DNA sequence: AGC
């Protein structure tokens, strides 16, 4: 059912993130031509993760996140027997080697503090390190503790914001931003 | 996934 959502999607981001996206909502049986914007966020995220393991040095982290979940499952087993961490409870997105800790990142269209509450008490997880980026250019990390250096972080907020701008352009924002 |  032609959604104009669906054919922004398919501009905003790059093909490996669409297929990606597609393949995660449909592993869990998802439609997205429906569900567009849970399509749309699902692509957001993706992206945000593959940015922020850019910003890190070449052999800083191991991507979870983009993986089917049996192999995710399997990396996350590798990461917590040879380094001793704690498994965690849900799929992390990535395992920082620097700092040893993994990472849940989240993308939110509310104050980002409420966002990493509820991401706080899902995770029992005291060790997994969560970094939460708005879409007005605000972001949230445990412990104040913010990994990536300045610029790395301040581009994914500018492509937020981005994606923000080319949603309203196209009176998608306030379907979005209200789902 | 995030409202
Ligand atoms: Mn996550």
């Known amino acids: 059912r032609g959604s104009h959502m669906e054919d922004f999607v398919r501009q905003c981001f790059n093909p490996m993130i669409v297929e990606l996206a597609e393949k995660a909502m449909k592993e869990y049986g998802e439609d ?3 569900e567009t914007n849970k399509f749309a966020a699902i692509c957001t995220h993706l992206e945000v993760c ?3 393991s850019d910003g890190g040095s070449k052999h800083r982290f191991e991507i979870i996140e983009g993986r089917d979940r049996i192999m995710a499952w399997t990396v996350v087993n590798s990461i917590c027997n040879t380094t ?3 498994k965690p409870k849900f799929l992390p997105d990535l395992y920082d080697y620097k ?3 993994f990472i849940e990142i989240g993308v939110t269209r509310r104050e980002v503090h409420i966002y990493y509450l509820e991401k706080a008490n899902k ?4 060790k997994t390190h969560i970094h939460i980026f708005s879409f007005t250019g605000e972001e949230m990390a445990t412990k104040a503790d913010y990994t990536l250096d300045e610029e790395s972080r301040a581009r994914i907020k500018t492509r937020l914001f981005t994606i923000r701008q080319e949603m309203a352009s196209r009176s998608l924002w ?3 931003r209200q789902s």
Do not use: A, H, L, T
């Not at 995770?123 to 005291?126: L, P, Y």
């Open 32 to 34: 997205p031509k429906i």
């Open 50 to 52: 593959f940015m922020y």
């Open 84 to 86: 001793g961490v704690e």
């Open 99 to 101: 700092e040893n800790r």
């Open 123 to 126: 995770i029992k997880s005291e």
């Open 174 to 176: 306030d379907s979005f």
